[PDB]
Amino acid sequence: SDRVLQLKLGNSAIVTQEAANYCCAYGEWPNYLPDHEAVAIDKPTQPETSTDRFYTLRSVKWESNSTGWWWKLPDALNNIGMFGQNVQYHYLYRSGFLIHVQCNATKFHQGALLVVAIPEHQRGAHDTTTSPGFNDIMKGERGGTFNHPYVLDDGTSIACATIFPHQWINLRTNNSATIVLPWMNVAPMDFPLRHNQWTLAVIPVVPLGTRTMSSVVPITVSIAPMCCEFNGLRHAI
Amino acid sequence: GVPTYLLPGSGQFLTTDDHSSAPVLPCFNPTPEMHIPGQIRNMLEMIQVESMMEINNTDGANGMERLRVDISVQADLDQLLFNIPLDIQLDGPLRNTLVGNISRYYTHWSGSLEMTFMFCGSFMATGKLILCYTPPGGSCPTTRETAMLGTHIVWDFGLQSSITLIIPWISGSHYRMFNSDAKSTNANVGYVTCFMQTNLIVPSESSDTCSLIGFIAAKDDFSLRLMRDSPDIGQSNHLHGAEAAYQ
Amino acid sequence: GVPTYLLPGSGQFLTTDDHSSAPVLPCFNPTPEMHIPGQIRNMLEMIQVESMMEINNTDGANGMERLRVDISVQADLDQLLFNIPLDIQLDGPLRNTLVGNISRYYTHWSGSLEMTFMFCGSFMATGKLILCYTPPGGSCPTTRETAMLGTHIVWDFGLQSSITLIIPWISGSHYRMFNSDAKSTNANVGYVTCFMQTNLIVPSESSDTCSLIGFIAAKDDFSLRLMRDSPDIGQSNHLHGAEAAYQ
Amino acid sequence: GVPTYLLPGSGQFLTTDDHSSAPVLPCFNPTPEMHIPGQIRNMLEMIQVESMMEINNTDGANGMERLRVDISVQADLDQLLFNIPLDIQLDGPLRNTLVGNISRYYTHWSGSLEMTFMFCGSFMATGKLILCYTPPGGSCPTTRETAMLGTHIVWDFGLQSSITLIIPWISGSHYRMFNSDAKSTNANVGYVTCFMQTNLIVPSESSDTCSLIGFIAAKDDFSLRLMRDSPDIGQSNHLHGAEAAYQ
Amino acid sequence: NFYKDSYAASASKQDFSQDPSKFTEPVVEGLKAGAPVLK
Amino acid sequence: NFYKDSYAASASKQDFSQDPSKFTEPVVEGLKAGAPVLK
Amino acid sequence: NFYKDSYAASASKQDFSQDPSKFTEPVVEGLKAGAPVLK
Amino acid sequence: VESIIKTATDTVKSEINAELGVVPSLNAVETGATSNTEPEEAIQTRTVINQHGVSETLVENFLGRAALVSKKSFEYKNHASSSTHKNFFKWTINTKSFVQLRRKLELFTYLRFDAEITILTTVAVNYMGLPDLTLQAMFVPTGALTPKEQDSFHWQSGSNASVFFKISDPPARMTIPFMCINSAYSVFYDGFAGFEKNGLYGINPADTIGNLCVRIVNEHQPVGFTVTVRVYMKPKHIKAWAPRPPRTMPYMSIANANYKGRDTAPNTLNAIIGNRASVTTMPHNIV
């Protein structure tokens, strides 16, 4: 009942038969920008189904020595489908996100992944006073990897990361995690190419292990923008 | 008496404080008020008046030549005529305007701007131009096919001599600000470019080089915040006669 | 005028004082408020969220290995698996948690704590554990027959992956406090121990060593008092770039 | 602003002043009150409890021997047994009592005092004593015929073991005071003397020397004024460990 | 203001009246929106 | 008290309630005036 | 506050509103007490 | 779900439980929700009317403290032959230089507040008395034109706010309003504040209150003095959003979250908590 779920947006749908309810970040739900909070005065474009749909990124392999993975939003999708086109042709964007992380194995496998959506995850660099560079931050669809997941690569800690919207994928329990993210920013809209509102982090707190037949165990991420709005139309960047 | 205690801040002189103070001349009767034309109560009233942009701010252009942009009959199509940097908080064609000068007494701004161009060629001269406003993000467009994708107005020369290009307030944040970095995401407004839509066409006896005068002003959805000393005036010495005021 | 007199305390600057003070920018209009997700109004809201305890804080355990406790199939009965010191005011498995970090900004605390453990072995793995909370007074129990006499929960591994051990507020005084003496009668909370109730049992193809992740949080009957500087952060030199802020 | 002026006294620190002052810990929530037995709200409640007079304050009498007065079977008639100086403001049998100790934190006093004596001989012992209070003016009486002329109570030993001699407030002025001069007209209270009315009579197997324990207390018509430092405690050096509080 | 002369009072920052048209549109005949200004 | 915390207030010298008997006569059975205390 | 700008006022320590559930239970379907969370 | 809480919740007495299908102590951490097991369901409880207050943990109070944000000492003298702060200095305001305040602010993602600024001045002779100097602190907007000399005409402060104060007066004080161009300050910023790619990461200029220019107004004396200016900031009228994991590794720079960790636990990169001999070793065990 709270273990099965179907998500449908646009021409895309996803089902899971081993869910663990699902998370609504801070108890909120995505919505379009109301007139009393608006700033940009040009009429926005709300493409709906062409952008508010699931985009599945390339999978990653969960290995015995993996440290974890991360994908920044909207960066990870800024070059995918019609969402990517609207982002490139407009100075301003706004949207929520429906995140679905997938990972199945066997009744003989064990492992636990923390799936957390971090707002404003400003990364820190290790053992240097030099700030992270553009290429250390903007990885796009490929996403990045954690150097020191123990401190969330920002000098804090993964132990307290549960203060952020999250779920876990504990192999003996479930095979997917779902998190609904509302627009999260101090401004009603933003320039999509230089600021990432959220960072999706998937970290193996309990390593993958088994004594049965060894198989490649992938982790897949599907993300659907929600209530997309774009302002400041011009040429593509 | 009343028991009291002094708080931090006591005795200080804050130039922006607001208190009453001892009248130097008790029982003084100020001159009666008289109606005088042109009273202004909010500086926003002043910046809504359009003033001339110094678009031709180039070496070789002297004085008033800098206040007009000359356009000539072209031999090629879709020609770029000129562009205009838009930070009303930095030096450029927009700095010495009513909106620019007053805005520079502040740090934050928000609102739509309007650029009006008046064609000053002869009556027998005709033409169509396209004025484009490109929101920020990339490099300034250099071709009409690219500029045309932004906010724009196609202008046809005729009896009504002027056209207005509205630069709508399009910003992620409520306000934009000055911080001396023109490429900052909270400062850059984008670009304005002008191309021939068709061409300037004139008969043999009309001048084949005509001028445009560009004006700019704020609309009534404008707002300015955080007053600061203006960078447009300064002194390194006493002005002549200043010391004589003591003699 | 009004006759007055200054009281002791006049002119002092108390960092915790609460008074109004001169506005630097008169007539300034702050940016309109906008709804933003996740507003927090009382720090007690933050400590009610469970976070990971660093139970395996031992030499040889690096990084995240310290955040999980591995249990193996035992050869003997009633085996002790691990224990956890409980002073959320001193360094130990509970210090770097949401409740621990925030509580260390205070000196007094009261309320029930809750420890939740999630079994992360394979589906085919089964087992029963007993988690015990022993109120203070003596030495930490080392046998199940002794630990079992305190507050406890017997946990059966199954579909519901996690169990919660409530550490009820059991104290003579309204609040407990920190004073750097872990054995003080107003500080020591007691102990938490974990033993096999039966045993971890797994088939040949399941890993025979499984991990538990322990979490802790405060319940809504919690209260914190007497704010103080946190011992978890400090500096002996200027941070890099600090002096450059003056250049 | 408000025109004001500072009065003499401004800035001073008077140890007996009464004003509100800045809360060090804003929003601090004190521990809830709990009912506790024995609350005292006025020190006058404490001095109404009778305590032991050190009547036998003589060389040779050590410790508790000083708290009891021994009386023996007499060979002569109308014998004087003992007397008691009455200035509860000077050193003497009355100084280390509840009423004496608290009164010495003050300078002025008024009200009736009560002296109760408990006979502690054996049951088979009998006797009659006369306790006399002599208002001031002359020398302390040394014979019963003289003492008997003042305020007194004749005490018959029996089942009710104790007798009370009331020292009624008899003074010209509303209050009496301390000024270190025991013979001052505003300080001297008079005298209390005790004589055999008949004799202490006991059988062969009862002790022929018995003790009395004298107690004193103030009645509820008592009043104390003008607080001062008590002369009963003092220091000339730092107490042991005082300086260690700084290490 | 505890002083007897009113000019001694603190600032008066409450005059929100405006009339930009005395500067922006001082033309005798009002210009209608959309209509050709010169006719 | 102009401070926000009530504990900052000046002294409270108005509690004239008293009950000396909790110290002077803590006996279970009240002693009647004039009557022999031991009976 | 005797100053004309409201932001100059003393602190506002009276907001006792709370909603821990936005952090402790941000699940779409409320979890019933006693009932198995996963069904 | 939202409600007014003024005291810790009360406890209700509970009885024995033996109900099939009811397992309050079991939970599913995978959902992301924190355990909802109540004490009454875990053990038999008594009734307790809890009067413990919760006001000291109100965000307004937690962050409502004047914390040191700037400390600058310079030489007040005739700087004829100085290479050096010549009787004045400029400070780009930031709340990242002193760790106690920084760590607390960083417990939140976004913060909206007005800032009470207090300025404390101290002097020492480089003995024949301490002069009661007059100082001027001028607020110059972020990136704006700052004075280059003690006697620069820039100090005329025609529009910039300036506060003049004496060392003998109580510390100067004034409130800077919430002046961000957004609805709240970004304590953390996962982005680049420029349209090009070489800009600084994690630094949103919109979150820099501005420059504080401080000078001694008096001309130099025949002898030199060391003057130290300390600035304290107390946020008020606070609204906070999205709490975050507390900083564990020592701070390295005011410009980023770079980390290294201490040389040995506690708070070392591979071990935040100090070590104990084993998971069955009880530290501070009562002997």
Ligand SMILES: CC(=O)N[C@@H]1[C@@H](O)[C@H](O[C@@H]2O[C@H](CO)[C@H](O)[C@H](O[C@]3(C(=O)O)C[C@H](O)[C@@H](NC(C)=O)[C@H]([C@H](O)[C@H](O)CO)O3)[C@H]2O)[C@@H](CO)O[C@H]1O
């Ligand atoms: C000797 C032994 O038996 N066991 C040690 C064990 O004591 C040691 O633990 C450290 O011990 C000290 C006490 O000496 C502290 O309790 C350390 O904790 C904290 C503190 O609470 O004060 C935690 C805090 O986060 C730290 N702060 C910072 C800013 O870094 C401080 C800090 O380092 C100290 O105050 C230093 O001055 O410490 C606690 O870890 C462990 C180390 O592995 O080793 C055992 O052998």
